[PDB]
mmCIF file of C-alpha atoms in Angstrom:
data_model
loop_
_atom_site.group_PDB
_atom_site.id
_atom_site.type_symbol
_atom_site.label_atom_id
_atom_site.label_comp_id
_atom_site.label_asym_id
_atom_site.label_seq_id
_atom_site.Cartn_x
_atom_site.Cartn_y
_atom_site.Cartn_z
ATOM 1 C CA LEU A 1 84.438 66.562 79.240
ATOM 2 C CA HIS A 2 84.214 62.649 78.859
ATOM 3 C CA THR A 3 84.909 60.919 75.614
ATOM 4 C CA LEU A 4 84.660 57.113 74.472
ATOM 5 C CA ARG A 5 86.564 56.279 71.121
ATOM 6 C CA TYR A 6 86.883 53.063 69.185
ATOM 7 C CA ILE A 7 89.872 53.377 66.675
ATOM 8 C CA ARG A 8 89.727 50.582 63.936
ATOM 9 C CA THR A 9 92.306 50.095 61.143
ATOM 10 C CA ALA A 10 92.198 47.443 58.243
ATOM 11 C CA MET A 11 95.252 47.237 56.098
ATOM 12 C CA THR A 12 96.345 45.530 52.956
ATOM 13 C CA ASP A 13 100.221 46.173 53.307
ATOM 14 C CA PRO A 14 100.773 46.422 57.152
ATOM 15 C CA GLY A 15 104.596 45.537 57.276
ATOM 16 C CA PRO A 16 106.796 42.707 58.175
ATOM 17 C CA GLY A 17 105.639 40.948 61.615
ATOM 18 C CA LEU A 18 102.694 43.402 62.229
ATOM 19 C CA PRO A 19 99.027 42.874 62.189
ATOM 20 C CA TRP A 20 96.751 43.944 59.242
ATOM 21 C CA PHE A 21 93.743 44.644 61.768
ATOM 22 C CA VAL A 22 94.079 46.797 64.840
ATOM 23 C CA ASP A 23 91.191 47.781 67.236
ATOM 24 C CA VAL A 24 92.001 50.289 70.052
ATOM 25 C CA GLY A 25 89.726 51.803 72.711
ATOM 26 C CA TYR A 26 90.045 55.039 74.457
ATOM 27 C CA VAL A 27 88.435 56.685 77.659
ATOM 28 C CA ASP A 28 89.301 60.471 77.827
ATOM 29 C CA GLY A 29 92.204 60.067 75.459
ATOM 30 C CA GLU A 30 93.619 56.971 77.530
ATOM 31 C CA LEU A 31 93.941 53.473 76.173
ATOM 32 C CA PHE A 32 91.997 50.786 78.011
ATOM 33 C CA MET A 33 90.959 48.293 75.185
ATOM 34 C CA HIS A 34 93.055 46.567 72.546
ATOM 35 C CA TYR A 35 92.597 44.105 69.763
ATOM 36 C CA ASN A 36 94.913 42.843 66.881
ATOM 37 C CA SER A 37 94.527 40.270 64.062
ATOM 38 C CA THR A 38 97.539 38.249 65.522
ATOM 39 C CA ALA A 39 96.338 37.664 69.096
ATOM 40 C CA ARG A 40 92.526 37.501 67.988
ATOM 41 C CA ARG A 41 91.506 38.610 71.769
ATOM 42 C CA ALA A 42 90.185 41.905 73.457
ATOM 43 C CA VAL A 43 92.373 42.463 76.161
ATOM 44 C CA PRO A 44 92.514 45.404 79.014
ATOM 45 C CA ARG A 45 95.300 47.903 78.956
ATOM 46 C CA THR A 46 94.584 49.634 82.368
ATOM 47 C CA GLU A 47 94.305 48.254 86.011
ATOM 48 C CA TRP A 48 90.951 50.120 86.606
ATOM 49 C CA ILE A 49 89.155 48.382 83.693
ATOM 50 C CA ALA A 50 90.597 44.707 84.450
ATOM 51 C CA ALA A 51 89.455 44.989 88.186
ATOM 52 C CA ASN A 52 85.917 46.270 87.357
ATOM 53 C CA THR A 53 85.153 43.921 84.430
ATOM 54 C CA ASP A 54 84.820 39.949 84.511
ATOM 55 C CA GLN A 55 85.866 37.428 81.657
ATOM 56 C CA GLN A 56 82.232 37.399 80.290
ATOM 57 C CA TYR A 57 82.627 41.126 79.337
ATOM 58 C CA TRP A 58 86.135 40.481 77.457
ATOM 59 C CA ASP A 59 84.363 37.409 75.777
ATOM 60 C CA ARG A 60 81.593 39.508 74.206
ATOM 61 C CA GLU A 61 84.174 42.160 73.156
ATOM 62 C CA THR A 62 86.231 39.450 71.283
ATOM 63 C CA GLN A 63 83.372 37.869 69.187
ATOM 64 C CA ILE A 64 82.083 41.311 68.296
ATOM 65 C CA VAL A 65 85.567 42.629 67.104
ATOM 66 C CA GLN A 66 86.435 39.078 65.618
ATOM 67 C CA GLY A 67 83.192 39.657 63.345
ATOM 68 C CA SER A 68 84.332 43.478 62.687
ATOM 69 C CA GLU A 69 87.716 41.914 61.484
ATOM 70 C CA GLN A 70 85.868 39.714 59.052
ATOM 71 C CA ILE A 71 83.418 42.565 57.851
ATOM 72 C CA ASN A 72 86.520 44.903 57.320
ATOM 73 C CA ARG A 73 88.471 41.995 55.447
ATOM 74 C CA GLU A 74 85.423 41.953 53.018
ATOM 75 C CA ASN A 75 85.444 45.945 52.759
ATOM 76 C CA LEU A 76 89.076 45.970 51.601
ATOM 77 C CA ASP A 77 88.154 43.448 48.668
ATOM 78 C CA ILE A 78 84.914 45.122 47.923
ATOM 79 C CA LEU A 79 86.178 48.779 47.663
ATOM 80 C CA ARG A 80 89.229 47.713 45.599
ATOM 81 C CA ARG A 81 86.859 46.357 42.972
ATOM 82 C CA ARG A 82 84.637 49.168 43.080
ATOM 83 C CA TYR A 83 87.412 51.888 42.594
ATOM 84 C CA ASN A 84 88.878 49.352 39.923
ATOM 85 C CA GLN A 85 92.485 49.651 41.790
ATOM 86 C CA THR A 86 95.354 47.093 40.904
ATOM 87 C CA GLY A 87 97.261 46.220 44.234
ATOM 88 C CA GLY A 88 99.394 48.394 46.365
ATOM 89 C CA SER A 89 98.729 49.870 49.711
ATOM 90 C CA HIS A 90 94.931 50.334 50.679
ATOM 91 C CA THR A 91 93.638 51.285 54.309
ATOM 92 C CA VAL A 92 89.949 51.402 55.753
ATOM 93 C CA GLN A 93 89.743 53.270 58.877
ATOM 94 C CA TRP A 94 86.753 53.282 61.296
ATOM 95 C CA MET A 95 85.937 55.740 64.217
ATOM 96 C CA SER A 96 83.147 55.186 66.540
ATOM 97 C CA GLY A 97 81.882 56.809 69.902
ATOM 98 C CA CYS A 98 80.302 59.466 72.001
ATOM 99 C CA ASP A 99 81.071 62.748 73.985
ATOM 100 C CA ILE A 100 79.312 63.701 77.204
ATOM 101 C CA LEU A 101 79.822 67.276 77.393
ATOM 102 C CA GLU A 102 80.144 69.142 80.764
ATOM 103 C CA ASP A 103 76.841 70.923 80.152
ATOM 104 C CA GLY A 104 75.187 67.306 79.492
ATOM 105 C CA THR A 105 74.845 67.516 75.723
ATOM 106 C CA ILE A 106 75.532 64.234 73.973
ATOM 107 C CA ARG A 107 77.381 64.050 70.708
ATOM 108 C CA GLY A 108 77.525 60.735 68.729
ATOM 109 C CA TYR A 109 79.930 59.840 66.059
ATOM 110 C CA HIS A 110 80.427 56.863 63.532
ATOM 111 C CA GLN A 111 82.507 57.641 60.368
ATOM 112 C CA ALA A 112 84.935 55.704 57.934
ATOM 113 C CA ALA A 113 87.765 56.545 55.610
ATOM 114 C CA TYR A 114 89.290 54.830 52.451
ATOM 115 C CA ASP A 115 92.976 55.760 51.685
ATOM 116 C CA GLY A 116 93.068 58.428 54.418
ATOM 117 C CA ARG A 117 90.181 60.302 52.811
ATOM 118 C CA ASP A 118 86.574 60.773 54.167
ATOM 119 C CA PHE A 119 84.290 57.869 52.923
ATOM 120 C CA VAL A 120 80.985 57.739 54.938
ATOM 121 C CA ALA A 121 79.690 59.603 57.966
ATOM 122 C CA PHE A 122 76.542 58.902 60.025
ATOM 123 C CA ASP A 123 74.339 62.075 60.722
ATOM 124 C CA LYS A 124 72.345 61.447 64.082
ATOM 125 C CA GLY A 125 70.039 64.547 63.500
ATOM 126 C CA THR A 126 68.812 63.381 60.205
ATOM 127 C CA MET A 127 69.263 59.434 60.813
ATOM 128 C CA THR A 128 70.999 58.932 57.315
ATOM 129 C CA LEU A 129 74.649 57.838 56.216
ATOM 130 C CA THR A 130 76.298 60.699 54.425
ATOM 131 C CA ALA A 131 78.345 59.650 51.376
ATOM 132 C CA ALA A 132 81.367 62.081 51.089
ATOM 133 C CA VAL A 133 82.619 60.566 47.790
ATOM 134 C CA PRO A 134 80.913 59.164 44.676
ATOM 135 C CA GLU A 135 82.149 55.613 45.570
ATOM 136 C CA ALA A 136 80.313 55.738 48.877
ATOM 137 C CA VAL A 137 76.844 55.841 47.218
ATOM 138 C CA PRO A 138 76.443 51.971 46.895
ATOM 139 C CA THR A 139 77.428 51.811 50.792
ATOM 140 C CA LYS A 140 74.346 54.115 51.517
ATOM 141 C CA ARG A 141 72.139 51.846 49.389
ATOM 142 C CA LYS A 142 73.133 48.932 51.607
ATOM 143 C CA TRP A 143 72.541 50.861 54.747
ATOM 144 C CA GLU A 144 69.054 52.053 53.574
ATOM 145 C CA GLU A 145 68.105 48.500 52.636
ATOM 146 C CA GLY A 146 69.156 47.126 56.034
ATOM 147 C CA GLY A 147 67.893 49.992 57.976
ATOM 148 C CA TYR A 148 70.849 50.291 60.366
ATOM 149 C CA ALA A 149 70.200 53.954 61.071
ATOM 150 C CA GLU A 150 67.643 53.112 63.873
ATOM 151 C CA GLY A 151 69.994 50.640 65.588
ATOM 152 C CA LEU A 152 72.955 52.901 65.385
ATOM 153 C CA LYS A 153 70.941 55.927 66.854
ATOM 154 C CA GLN A 154 70.044 53.867 70.193
ATOM 155 C CA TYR A 155 73.607 52.921 70.655
ATOM 156 C CA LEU A 156 75.128 56.470 70.297
ATOM 157 C CA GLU A 157 72.483 58.078 72.464
ATOM 158 C CA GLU A 158 71.988 55.336 75.281
ATOM 159 C CA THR A 159 74.342 52.310 75.079
ATOM 160 C CA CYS A 160 77.584 54.373 74.520
ATOM 161 C CA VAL A 161 76.667 56.867 77.185
ATOM 162 C CA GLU A 162 75.799 54.236 80.015
ATOM 163 C CA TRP A 163 79.097 52.415 79.630
ATOM 164 C CA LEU A 164 81.394 55.615 79.288
ATOM 165 C CA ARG A 165 79.693 56.739 82.739
ATOM 166 C CA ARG A 166 80.810 53.415 84.102
ATOM 167 C CA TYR A 167 84.568 53.741 82.796
ATOM 168 C CA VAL A 168 84.745 57.219 84.114
ATOM 169 C CA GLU A 169 83.693 56.030 87.539
ATOM 170 C CA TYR A 170 86.176 53.005 87.412
ATOM 171 C CA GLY A 171 89.140 55.022 86.372
ATOM 172 C CA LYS A 172 88.220 58.255 88.299
ATOM 173 C CA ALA A 173 91.325 57.904 90.716
ATOM 174 C CA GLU A 174 93.810 57.358 87.564
ATOM 175 C CA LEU A 175 92.515 59.944 85.177
ATOM 176 C CA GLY A 176 92.413 62.752 87.977
ATOM 177 C CA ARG A 177 95.877 61.616 89.422
ATOM 178 C CA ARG A 178 98.228 64.640 88.814
ATOM 179 C CA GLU A 179 101.980 63.886 87.880
ATOM 180 C CA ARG A 180 104.647 66.674 88.317
ATOM 181 C CA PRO A 181 107.102 67.180 85.451
ATOM 182 C CA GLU A 182 110.949 66.859 85.838
ATOM 183 C CA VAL A 183 112.001 70.130 83.989
ATOM 184 C CA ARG A 184 115.671 70.593 82.415
ATOM 185 C CA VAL A 185 116.933 73.838 80.948
ATOM 186 C CA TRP A 186 119.625 73.464 78.100
ATOM 187 C CA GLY A 187 121.674 75.721 75.391
ATOM 188 C CA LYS A 188 123.361 75.054 72.222
ATOM 189 C CA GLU A 189 125.923 77.528 70.642
ATOM 190 C CA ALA A 190 126.161 77.521 66.784
ATOM 191 C CA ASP A 191 127.009 80.506 64.344
ATOM 192 C CA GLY A 192 126.700 83.211 66.787
ATOM 193 C CA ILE A 193 123.308 81.964 67.959
ATOM 194 C CA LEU A 194 122.451 80.582 71.337
ATOM 195 C CA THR A 195 119.481 78.193 70.955
ATOM 196 C CA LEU A 196 117.841 77.612 74.562
ATOM 197 C CA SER A 197 115.940 74.492 75.286
ATOM 198 C CA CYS A 198 113.236 73.677 78.013
ATOM 199 C CA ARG A 199 112.304 70.067 78.330
ATOM 200 C CA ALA A 200 109.306 68.613 80.734
ATOM 201 C CA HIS A 201 109.591 64.884 81.501
ATOM 202 C CA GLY A 202 106.600 62.737 82.492
ATOM 203 C CA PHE A 203 103.776 65.059 83.205
ATOM 204 C CA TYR A 204 99.899 64.033 83.768
ATOM 205 C CA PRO A 205 97.385 65.189 82.572
ATOM 206 C CA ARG A 206 98.190 66.153 78.932
ATOM 207 C CA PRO A 207 97.197 69.914 78.909
ATOM 208 C CA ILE A 208 100.352 72.161 79.453
ATOM 209 C CA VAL A 209 101.532 75.697 78.952
ATOM 210 C CA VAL A 210 105.451 75.670 78.503
ATOM 211 C CA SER A 211 106.603 79.338 77.721
ATOM 212 C CA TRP A 212 109.797 81.382 77.447
ATOM 213 C CA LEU A 213 110.387 84.563 79.327
ATOM 214 C CA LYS A 214 113.010 87.341 78.698
ATOM 215 C CA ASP A 215 113.777 89.751 81.660
ATOM 216 C CA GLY A 216 110.381 88.450 83.350
ATOM 217 C CA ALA A 217 108.362 88.954 80.152
ATOM 218 C CA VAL A 218 106.611 86.279 78.178
ATOM 219 C CA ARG A 219 108.287 85.581 74.509
ATOM 220 C CA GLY A 220 105.526 83.533 72.838
ATOM 221 C CA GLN A 221 106.150 84.347 69.083
ATOM 222 C CA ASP A 222 109.899 83.841 69.215
ATOM 223 C CA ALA A 223 109.426 80.393 71.032
ATOM 224 C CA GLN A 224 109.060 77.234 68.830
ATOM 225 C CA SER A 225 107.533 73.984 70.284
ATOM 226 C CA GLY A 226 107.461 70.258 69.134
ATOM 227 C CA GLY A 227 103.872 69.663 70.528
ATOM 228 C CA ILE A 228 102.781 67.307 73.316
ATOM 229 C CA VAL A 229 104.524 63.850 72.711
ATOM 230 C CA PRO A 230 103.556 60.589 74.682
ATOM 231 C CA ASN A 231 105.718 58.403 76.959
ATOM 232 C CA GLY A 232 105.564 54.451 76.945
ATOM 233 C CA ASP A 233 104.272 54.381 80.689
ATOM 234 C CA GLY A 234 101.328 56.571 79.877
ATOM 235 C CA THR A 235 103.018 60.126 80.922
ATOM 236 C CA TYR A 236 103.608 63.059 78.342
ATOM 237 C CA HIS A 237 106.754 64.943 77.084
ATOM 238 C CA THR A 238 107.078 68.473 75.675
ATOM 239 C CA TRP A 239 110.127 70.709 74.580
ATOM 240 C CA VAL A 240 110.227 74.487 73.823
ATOM 241 C CA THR A 241 113.259 76.183 72.147
ATOM 242 C CA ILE A 242 114.296 79.881 71.744
ATOM 243 C CA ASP A 243 116.864 81.817 69.692
ATOM 244 C CA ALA A 244 119.073 84.209 71.706
ATOM 245 C CA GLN A 245 122.315 86.022 71.610
ATOM 246 C CA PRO A 246 125.528 84.405 73.359
ATOM 247 C CA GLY A 247 125.951 86.026 76.848
ATOM 248 C CA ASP A 248 122.159 86.575 77.441
ATOM 249 C CA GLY A 249 121.202 82.914 78.383
ATOM 250 C CA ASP A 250 120.611 83.611 82.056
ATOM 251 C CA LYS A 251 118.128 86.574 81.286
ATOM 252 C CA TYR A 252 115.787 83.757 79.998
ATOM 253 C CA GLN A 253 113.340 81.849 82.148
ATOM 254 C CA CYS A 254 111.185 78.694 81.403
ATOM 255 C CA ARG A 255 107.625 78.963 82.725
ATOM 256 C CA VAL A 256 105.432 75.818 83.181
ATOM 257 C CA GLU A 257 101.850 75.998 83.662
ATOM 258 C CA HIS A 258 100.302 72.476 84.863
ATOM 259 C CA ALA A 259 97.456 71.072 86.961
ATOM 260 C CA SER A 260 100.007 69.104 89.193
ATOM 261 C CA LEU A 261 101.777 72.581 90.127
ATOM 262 C CA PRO A 262 99.771 75.130 92.407
ATOM 263 C CA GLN A 263 101.520 78.041 90.860
ATOM 264 C CA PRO A 264 103.470 78.347 87.584
ATOM 265 C CA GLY A 265 107.065 76.914 87.845
ATOM 266 C CA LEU A 266 109.929 79.109 87.053
ATOM 267 C CA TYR A 267 113.300 77.655 85.846
ATOM 268 C CA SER A 268 116.700 78.863 84.787
ATOM 269 C CA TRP A 269 119.682 77.308 83.000
ATOM 270 C CA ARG A 270 122.444 78.153 85.861
ATOM 271 C CA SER A 271 120.074 77.402 88.777
ATOM 272 C CA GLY A 272 119.879 73.679 87.671
ATOM 273 C CA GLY A 273 116.394 73.776 86.199
ATOM 274 C CA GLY A 274 114.085 71.365 88.054
ATOM 275 C CA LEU A 275 116.693 70.457 90.498
ATOM 276 C CA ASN A 276 116.083 73.722 92.310
ATOM 277 C CA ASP A 277 112.624 72.204 93.302
ATOM 278 C CA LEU B 1 101.552 62.307 53.916
ATOM 279 C CA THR B 2 105.506 62.700 55.172
ATOM 280 C CA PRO B 3 105.717 61.658 58.874
ATOM 281 C CA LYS B 4 106.878 64.282 61.592
ATOM 282 C CA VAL B 5 109.490 62.632 63.814
ATOM 283 C CA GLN B 6 111.082 63.724 67.077
ATOM 284 C CA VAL B 7 113.417 61.591 69.501
ATOM 285 C CA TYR B 8 113.445 62.162 73.380
ATOM 286 C CA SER B 9 114.242 60.212 76.616
ATOM 287 C CA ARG B 10 111.643 59.320 79.198
ATOM 288 C CA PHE B 11 113.712 60.737 82.326
ATOM 289 C CA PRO B 12 116.640 63.413 81.967
ATOM 290 C CA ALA B 13 119.823 61.594 80.890
ATOM 291 C CA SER B 14 122.358 60.642 83.547
ATOM 292 C CA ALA B 15 125.544 58.777 83.448
ATOM 293 C CA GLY B 16 125.269 54.965 83.816
ATOM 294 C CA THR B 17 121.462 55.071 84.717
ATOM 295 C CA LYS B 18 118.595 53.104 83.235
ATOM 296 C CA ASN B 19 116.269 55.283 81.000
ATOM 297 C CA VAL B 20 113.823 54.707 78.035
ATOM 298 C CA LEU B 21 114.638 56.218 74.413
ATOM 299 C CA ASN B 22 111.347 57.179 72.734
ATOM 300 C CA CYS B 23 110.823 58.007 68.880
ATOM 301 C CA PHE B 24 107.300 59.285 67.927
ATOM 302 C CA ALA B 25 106.126 59.757 64.383
ATOM 303 C CA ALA B 26 102.671 61.365 63.300
ATOM 304 C CA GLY B 27 100.881 62.814 60.348
ATOM 305 C CA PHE B 28 101.651 60.158 57.992
ATOM 306 C CA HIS B 29 99.929 57.861 55.278
ATOM 307 C CA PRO B 30 100.041 54.967 54.366
ATOM 308 C CA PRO B 31 100.223 53.473 57.805
ATOM 309 C CA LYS B 32 103.277 51.131 56.962
ATOM 310 C CA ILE B 33 106.203 52.754 58.556
ATOM 311 C CA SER B 34 109.808 51.324 59.452
ATOM 312 C CA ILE B 35 111.130 52.970 62.649
ATOM 313 C CA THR B 36 114.415 51.898 63.958
ATOM 314 C CA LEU B 37 116.201 53.125 67.343
ATOM 315 C CA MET B 38 120.066 52.937 66.777
ATOM 316 C CA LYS B 39 123.112 52.993 68.980
ATOM 317 C CA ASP B 40 126.086 54.231 66.975
ATOM 318 C CA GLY B 41 124.145 53.092 63.711
ATOM 319 C CA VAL B 42 123.235 49.705 65.176
ATOM 320 C CA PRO B 43 119.572 48.804 65.817
ATOM 321 C CA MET B 44 118.991 48.775 69.588
ATOM 322 C CA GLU B 45 117.528 45.649 71.454
ATOM 323 C CA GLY B 46 114.018 45.190 72.924
ATOM 324 C CA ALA B 47 112.321 47.848 70.994
ATOM 325 C CA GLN B 48 108.525 48.159 71.904
ATOM 326 C CA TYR B 49 106.170 49.190 69.028
ATOM 327 C CA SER B 50 102.911 50.876 69.713
ATOM 328 C CA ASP B 51 99.515 49.574 68.093
ATOM 329 C CA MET B 52 98.259 51.476 64.979
ATOM 330 C CA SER B 53 96.385 54.472 65.905
ATOM 331 C CA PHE B 54 95.195 57.636 64.080
ATOM 332 C CA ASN B 55 94.344 61.278 64.687
ATOM 333 C CA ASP B 56 91.544 63.857 63.527
ATOM 334 C CA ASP B 57 92.676 64.218 60.066
ATOM 335 C CA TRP B 58 92.878 60.295 59.765
ATOM 336 C CA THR B 59 96.697 60.601 59.725
ATOM 337 C CA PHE B 60 98.451 57.626 61.639
ATOM 338 C CA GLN B 61 100.803 57.805 64.604
ATOM 339 C CA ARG B 62 103.334 55.258 66.188
ATOM 340 C CA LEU B 63 105.442 55.452 69.392
ATOM 341 C CA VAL B 64 108.531 53.189 69.641
ATOM 342 C CA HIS B 65 110.300 52.969 73.052
ATOM 343 C CA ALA B 66 113.227 50.839 74.306
ATOM 344 C CA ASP B 67 114.881 50.526 77.783
ATOM 345 C CA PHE B 68 118.459 51.533 77.726
ATOM 346 C CA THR B 69 121.478 52.830 79.657
ATOM 347 C CA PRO B 70 123.023 56.023 77.907
ATOM 348 C CA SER B 71 126.694 55.261 77.424
ATOM 349 C CA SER B 72 129.323 58.243 77.262
ATOM 350 C CA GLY B 73 130.668 58.804 73.856
ATOM 351 C CA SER B 74 127.876 57.038 72.166
ATOM 352 C CA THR B 75 125.325 58.322 69.605
ATOM 353 C CA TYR B 76 121.660 57.451 69.945
ATOM 354 C CA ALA B 77 119.370 58.126 66.824
ATOM 355 C CA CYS B 78 116.331 57.145 65.185
ATOM 356 C CA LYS B 79 115.929 55.953 61.480
ATOM 357 C CA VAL B 80 112.615 56.352 59.669
ATOM 358 C CA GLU B 81 111.642 54.866 56.445
ATOM 359 C CA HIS B 82 108.449 55.458 54.572
ATOM 360 C CA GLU B 83 107.424 55.702 50.888
ATOM 361 C CA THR B 84 106.627 59.501 51.087
ATOM 362 C CA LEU B 85 110.432 60.080 52.051
ATOM 363 C CA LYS B 86 112.378 58.804 49.026
ATOM 364 C CA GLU B 87 115.527 58.532 51.179
ATOM 365 C CA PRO B 88 115.584 57.399 54.885
ATOM 366 C CA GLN B 89 115.604 60.092 57.488
ATOM 367 C CA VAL B 90 117.662 59.876 60.765
ATOM 368 C CA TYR B 91 116.755 61.939 63.839
ATOM 369 C CA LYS B 92 119.581 62.571 66.573
ATOM 370 C CA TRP B 93 118.743 62.500 70.237
ATOM 371 C CA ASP B 94 120.881 65.023 72.406
ATOM 372 C CA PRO B 95 121.308 64.089 76.157
ATOM 373 C CA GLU B 96 122.104 67.769 77.080
ATOM 374 C CA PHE B 97 119.359 69.387 74.805
ATOM 375 C CA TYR C 1 81.294 48.584 75.062
ATOM 376 C CA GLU C 2 81.849 48.134 71.247
ATOM 377 C CA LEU C 3 79.091 48.351 68.571
ATOM 378 C CA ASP C 4 77.825 45.432 66.506
ATOM 379 C CA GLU C 5 79.936 44.253 63.372
ATOM 380 C CA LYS C 6 76.964 44.866 61.046
ATOM 381 C CA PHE C 7 77.553 48.688 61.252
ATOM 382 C CA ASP C 8 81.086 48.370 59.897
ATOM 383 C CA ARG C 9 79.768 46.987 56.466
ATOM 384 C CA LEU C 10 80.812 49.048 53.323
#
């Protein structure tokens, strides 16, 4: 039900005018926290987090991620010498956070990846850092020496859970706010094949069921989707296409199932799509 | 891995009405990616690039959006450059599809 | 609320 995620990236080759280190925070899949190596500051991204937290909160977050930036800077140099790699593109990825399931079960996660492949993963049930690759064994030796397993256990089970419950309470109005999609039905004729398209513009929340219907019957297999893609303002977009015969286009209807709609919305090409209200 | 790209508008396209052209790329590694929004093969002004974020399988994703007014008889596209692509890939945006 | 920098050590 409720999730807290901290997405960290350390790069050797980021690109021109782009930061090498990026740290972003998410509450229920929505961005709220942001940090980059160029700005060197932890800043809010939503109105609900900024209005409910003071400057003292963002100061503690800045110094903790500034240190994380320095630690990951060392990690890129340590792992390149360990793997005996000579230049090129190398990436260190970090994933941290906790899930508060609807039944009350708490799941904790703290794992890393080197060059897009699993490196280390903390196992909460055994209190040990699992080394996925043979090059991740000296990392486990450093962890067993320091004894970070106990300090990480109390964070994922108590600290992470406490603050996620606060963020859920702060952003309850925004996360639960439903947004109706602007639907449009289109068609393209090519080599005796009529490709019908159905686009849903700016919907919230993210889960949606957009299906094609022929003579009032669902055509799941024949329909091709592009997945749920995000918009810059926070809303989502999706498109579903179907191959049909020319002169049969009006027999097809677009069905949209969403939380903002009390009943599934039916749309046709000739009726004007979403302009039919 | 090779990026999966799709180009779309924020609101349904209208004549001489302000909109936002979006270009989303996902499922790629390394994270270094060159994404360019074009207006008749010319890079569009004021392009906003999203912060580096990754999915379940550690594959990176980036959203590139720019405020624009769709002009009649103009072609809007998205150019993607990645080391796994060999040759640059261009994705066409259709206002009526 | 982010976790301490020492837990990012490799």
